# Entry
Amino acid sequence: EYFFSKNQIMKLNRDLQFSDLSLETEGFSPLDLEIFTEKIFYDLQLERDCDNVVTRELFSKSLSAFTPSALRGVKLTKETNIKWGDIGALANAKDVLLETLEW
Amino acid sequence: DCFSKDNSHFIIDPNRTKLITTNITNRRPLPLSRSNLQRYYGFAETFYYDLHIFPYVRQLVNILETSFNCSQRGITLNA
# Structure
């Protein structure tokens, strides 16, 4: 919010509220957030003609492409992202495993 | 000092010995779409891209045009 205020005046005017993208942006340093917000701000001339960037969840388009200064080098583990819904029929084990993890 | 009319038009003749070199002046260079300037003097023409079929070129040219256009808005975009 401070960074959005420190750019030349623009506003998050739609019913989106900052916590949404905050929960969407766990792995970021302050410098990364300054950059990410500048990348959003460039919407103001790259795509919109408006003097103010009503944001319309455009973050969901750009934040998929931008990345922090973290997450460097090609390393992955969550990529498959199949969730617990895609159990391999661990009927006699998924219970105890998820319980022992979650408690 | 030969004539009071000076602005509307004048003739140089190489029999007249003067010149001036006031460093530099700054002026906008012509757009290709109107000028086509290269093809007149026959230099190694740049490839004329189209604005559609190489979409990343549209991306880059818009990214630069942002800062030509924002000059009226006065913001220095630093693109």
In short: Chain A touches chain B through five residues (CB under 8 Å). The longest helix of chain A spans residues 30-41. DSSP finds six helices and no strands in chain A.
